[PDB]
Design a protein around this ligand. Structure first.
Ligand SMILES: CC(=O)N[C@@H]1[C@@H](O)[C@H](O)[C@@H](CO)O[C@@H]1O
Ligand SMILES: CC(=O)N[C@@H]1[C@@H](O)[C@H](O)[C@@H](CO)O[C@@H]1O
Ligand SMILES: [Mg+2]
Lengths: 734, 745
């Protein structure tokens, strides 16, 4: 129809915005047009005139120095040598001996404050009475004198000499009053503004730069940049113990979300969230009283908001808007409960950095569309310079097609989600609060270390099943909900995502085993249920369930015997064959048992599947485990029957259409639901089907810019053939 | 010349043995009428703990025993039944029902690690099954039980391997029991009388078999060439308790399923058991050697089979009075295992191939393997001489292969020639290198071994370190963390190597959390020492969130353990041309593609500086995932695939080097050699007594006034040798060849 679209604007372009709004069925702009007007609002910056007179009220952060080697009983530790001095400055106002910590990293012990001094004229700490040949660090408070995101944009775009925006912390009453008074006045001064687009609120996700103007530390969920002597003293009075600098710097980990969460972290999250939420409610209330909608950007200063924790609905936010990078980041936005609507800001950004922009635009659409069919988002839009995009007529036509397809989905489905064929729960330390947020370091930027696991979320994001996120605490307190078909546990050992020492809790192991034994399904990816040193002979504590353990060089005396790999199986049914590869694998056969080397490992790989980063020396726990891929003398893919249920091991799973199909088949197989797989399935992995039963229709989508041929199988057993063009979509009667 | 060579023979073969003996210059014959006539030193094999079923069938409670661990059985209620034998070879092993199971066995909840009270379990009278009650559902349970070993493990190996079918199984016996001990000594006394023709008693071996347990499918289940699983008994355990003041648990042997692998960080209970056992084994070996000497015979020990408790590298071995050790020559490392043994009068290598139909069959060319085995041992022998060589098996098989027979002639002649030219002295070593680990000298040349001479996927990246060193022109010693903590680092050491995966004897485990070890190594490197770390050196889990390799500061590299993903990693540009990599073959097409693709630009949460395409050119074996340089002043020499394989770092006066892994090859041995000279700031000493071509090596004998150059391959090799005075000589060495030249005396 028309609507559900946010068109960005600029000056001296009033005429073409009218044409592009008319062409794109836009109902919002970021004046006489009758459009909803969005205004970005930046609560903690844009007022150097305030903060320069109150410089002790900028946000602060605990910073950890480089490790400095003592070569006798004294050592000097430079504070600022590894940090960007334009962004960060040591706090000399708050008593260093009270607020800072010098640590001997070699022993883990805190150096007595009587044994170190801060230099009067240099940013350097002198430590005396120390042990030679140990490494020492300082953890110190630092003011953030440049708003991290503004700084990133400055550096990236090369804003040269432009004045640096100094950020402020509303935890201080003088600054808080300033902010609310300013917003009050701003509202009165902006009668044209229909939506306050808060970008964002009060605390920046951890984002620190080094002396070379490069990113030094980043965590999209990190709350490093949220301390002050006042907050820390108040925490102590509220929680009943004092936080150490170490509770923030975390030996150099800075409380990465990959770390197994500690009590101190959760307490700090609780404390910060209570404060942030009340102030956000106040901002929402002021916006509402002025007759405007309040919308939050899912990012930047989003720390303490916790959109997936209970009570978020109480803030009365009208909307969440977020960055659509892929399916996972789409679901991050779409699944948020307790706002009236959601918006994705789509790609490409309308920005200069011959080229055909339609390609990226249609790709972004596809990456997200498959997620949207599973969990609809209310609105779409783009950001930036609308005059720049007006130049590329093929891109404009692209957008008209997308906005239409977007509205047509809504018209056909009424914004109902597609029906899900199985209930899948991802189990980790965080649970619901980090829904779709597992494995992220930097937003939308998976890397070598993370992509073998992020691929699981990415596959699931657009899959025809219902995904929920549960924690070990949920499971321990309530058991496993009776409606769950499959639990997934995945990640490296000693992370929040596998769980760490929670696996040495016999109650957890009893609950899972009993549940799988009764008909449950457990899928372990990478190093599932891992717990180091607990048992000499068992690393994955649920190795018995999935039929696979990892050799950790404690069991090399025990010969490992691999059963023959099963090349024709339901799980691998869609993996493109490759006759000459299979032939070579069959001809080379399996190792003969040899002293100290076990036996039965294939001499050549079968291949055909990309499992990402290897988990070295995985092996089957007995010869009744079904090996599906075990190339290179270790195991990538296996399945094991366990009473009435099944476990599956996957070493890793980078996203691709092939690997989403593999995981999907894993899910149906492990839950003994093979006979449920056929209904509402595409024969081609490159296409997916969304069934909308109560509207009596289904659709099939081409997940690629390729023509794709596919056969859809209906519930009634009949089949229908399709020949979808680039990014296509066909609708049928159910 | 003639001698230093042991020939095997057999019945009805006098003519051919005489002929071959003369051809190969044999001075000893290993066990006929006219052969005994030949005037050769006669060797006879002796097997103290088997070959007497007539004794042990009448005393079956005196067979050796072993603690065994059952499969993990899942309880699905508060009771659980555990079969003892389903996972084991019932022809080899049987549960000891004689010795009270409640005193000697343990049922364990593996899910909690708790021992189940013995009131809660009973051994079924009729079946090999333990019934447990009062337990927790959904936990795993196991039993650790004493089993008699009713088939000699090595005899059984040979039976199954050679398809002996119905042949009677030899039952082994345990001299710890007084009755069997008297039998064994009376029998040996008698045998000595009945054997006046025998000059050398070749004990194969002594009292306790290395851990070797088979499964219900008649396959190897558990093996440790150093393991002392097969050494217990109710009496031995009770005697140990009395002596050491504490009771060993069954767990102290089964070790949660690890069975005390030499790779496990050694526990006190393991070392106490070794001390107890070797006290007993050694007193009894001495008696055998004394009885041999009194009968006018030499006593020679096989380094293998029943060698547990002998401890050839522990102090006091010389007091046994053994005349010799003989061992299997499997490669350079296994050659050094024998060669370096102190406290015997002479040592002997049994070379390959074994004279058996698996090698000696029509269409096979055993001369290739014969000469390959010689090349591998010869490079090690130059650094540490063995006194003698020889072969085992059926001479009648070898005799049918004239090419092989002529190859042996050549080998025997060259073996004696090296001996007559060097006078049995070791080559001069250019650097003093110490391997540091939990075991030290007691396991010299024995690090990274599971089964003898069988490196595998899990071990070859570390075993290659020893194989490279075995024939390398440096002096290699093996030192323990206890040595270093007690005495510091000896002042003659140029380089310390610490190699292996985390939580093993070879890296050292939580010893690296001991500040005094870290202090001692750091101060030594800062003062001009060199530390080379391979794989996961100095690693200690959980101790520091931001530092896994404790000496990451020395070598310049740490391993990301998924605790520090918020910290962007920045890799300096790789240095393709460097002393260490100077002999790596250049591949201009790889270098061009790597140069062109360049390095990753910094990206949020992804760091920067990683090469987009691999440079390659070096086989580093098993990857160590997510290694990274700790700062940008580290020199990266190879850092392909977004992680680090090879790096060096200046650390005061000294240097650290990181290598992710090192399979043995000519190229990687050259790489390691260069690392040693470079890390010790000895680049200036490298060229003296060296071969330009990595396929050849140089051995210098200053006291004899000579050097030699050897070709380690079966292809011709040209090489330029550099002498100490900076002069050079060019050689064109034939297949497997050697050349000798005068040096200053
Ligand atoms: C959703 C979100 O927080 N996006 C931010 C973006 O605003 C910022 O410019 C960038 C800097 O690295 O980090 C993230 O991508
Ligand atoms: C040196 C040594 O102990 N060798 C033994 C050999 O006797 C035995 O036949 C084999 C069985 O797997 O193990 C080892 O190779
Ligand atoms: Mg001064």
């Amino acid at each position: 129809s028309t609507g559900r679209f946010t068109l960005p604007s600029e000056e001296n372009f009033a005429e073409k915005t009218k044409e592009l709004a008319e062409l794109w069925g836009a109902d919002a702009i970021r004046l006489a047009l009758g459009k909803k007007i969005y205004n970005a609002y930046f609560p903690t910056r844009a007022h150097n005139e305030w903060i320069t007179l109150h410089m002790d009220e900028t946000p602060q952060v605990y910073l950890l120095t480089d490790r400095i080697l003592a070569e006798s009983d004294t050592v000097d530790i430079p504070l600022m040598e590894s940090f960007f001095a334009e962004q960060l400055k040591p706090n000399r106002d708050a008593d260093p001996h009270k607020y800072w910590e010098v640590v001997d990293r070699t022993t883990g012990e805190v150096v007595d404050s009587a044994n170190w001094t801060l230099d009067a004229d240099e940013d350097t700490v002198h430590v005396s009475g120390v042990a030679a040949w140990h490494e020492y660090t300082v953890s110190f408070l630092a003011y953030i004198i440049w708003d991290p995101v503004e700084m990133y944009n400055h550096l990236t775009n090369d804003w040269g000499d432009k004045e640096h925006e100094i950020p402020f912390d509303i935890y201080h009453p003088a600054t808080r009053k300033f902010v609310f008074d300013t917003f009050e006045q701003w509202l009165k001064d902006s009668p044209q503004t229909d939506v306050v687009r808060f970008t964002t609120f009060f605390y920046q996700f951890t984002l620190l730069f080094d002396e070379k103007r490069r990113e030094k530390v980043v965590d999209w969920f990190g709350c490093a940049c949220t301390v002050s002597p006042r907050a820390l003293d108040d925490f102590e009075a509220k929680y009943g113990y004092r936080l150490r600098p170490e509770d923030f710097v975390d030996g150099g980990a800075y409380n990465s979300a990959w770390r197994v969460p500690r009590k101190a972290q959760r307490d700090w999250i609780d404390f910060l969230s209570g404060f942030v939420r009340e102030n956000v409610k106040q901002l929402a209330d002021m916006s509402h009283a002025a007759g405007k909608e309040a919308m939050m950007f899912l990012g930047d200063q989003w720390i303490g908001t916790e959109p997936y924790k209970d009570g978020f609905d109480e803030l009365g936010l009208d909307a969440v808007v977020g960055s659509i990078g892929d399916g996972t980041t789409t679901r991050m936005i779409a699944d948020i409960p307790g706002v009236k609507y959601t918006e994705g800001r789509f790609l490409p950004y309308f920005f200069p950095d011959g080229n055909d922009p339609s390609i990226e635009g249609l790709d972004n659409w596809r990456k997200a569309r498959r997620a949207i069919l599973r969990s609809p988002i209310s609105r779409m839009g783009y950001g930036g310079y609308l005059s720049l995009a007006a130049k590329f007529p093929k891109f404009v036509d692209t957008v008209t097609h997308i906005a239409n397809e977007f509205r047509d989905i809504h018209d056909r489905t009424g914004g109902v989600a597609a029906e899900g064929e199985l209930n899948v729960a991802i189990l980790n330390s965080w649970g619901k609060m980090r829904s779709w947020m597992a494995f992220t370091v930097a937003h939308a930027l998976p890397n070598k270390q993370t992509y073998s696991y992020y691929g699981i979320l990415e596959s699931l994001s657009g899959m025809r099943v219902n995904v929920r996120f549960i924690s070990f605490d949920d499971v321990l307190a309530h058991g496993i909900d009776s409606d769950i078909d499959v639990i997934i546990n995945g990640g490296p050992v000693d992370t929040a995502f596998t769980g760490g020492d929670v696996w040495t809790n016999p109650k957890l192991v009893e609950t899972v085993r009993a549940w799988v034994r009764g008909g449950g399904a457990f899928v372990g990816v990478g190093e599932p249920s891992s717990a180091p040193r607990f048992q000499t002979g068992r690393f994955f504590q649920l190795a018995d369930v999935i039929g696979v353990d990892e050799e950790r060089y404690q069991t090399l005396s025990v010969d490992k015997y691999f059963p023959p790999v099963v090349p024709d199986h339901f799980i691998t049914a869609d993996v493109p064959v490759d006759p000459a590869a299979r032939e070579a694998w069959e001809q080379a056969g399996y190792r003969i048992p040899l002293s100290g080397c076990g036996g039965g490992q294939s001499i050549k790989p079968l291949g055909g599947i990309d499992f990402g980063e290897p988990v070295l020396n995985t092996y089957p726990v007995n010869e009744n485990v079904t090996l599906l891929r075990a190339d290179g003398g270790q195991v990538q893919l296996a399945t094991n029957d366990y009473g009435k249920g099944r476990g599956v091991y996957i070493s890793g799973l980078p996203y691709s259409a092939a690997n989403a199909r593999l995981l999907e088949r894993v899910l149906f197989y492990a839950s003994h639901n093979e006979d449920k797989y056929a209904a509402w399935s595409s024969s081609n992995p490159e296409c997916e089907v969304a069934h909308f039963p109560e509207q009596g229709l289904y659709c099939v989508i081409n997940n690629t810019d390729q023509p794709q041929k596919t056969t859809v199988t209906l519930a009634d057993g009949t089949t229908e053939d399709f020949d979808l063009p680039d990014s296509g979509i066909a609708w049928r009667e159910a």
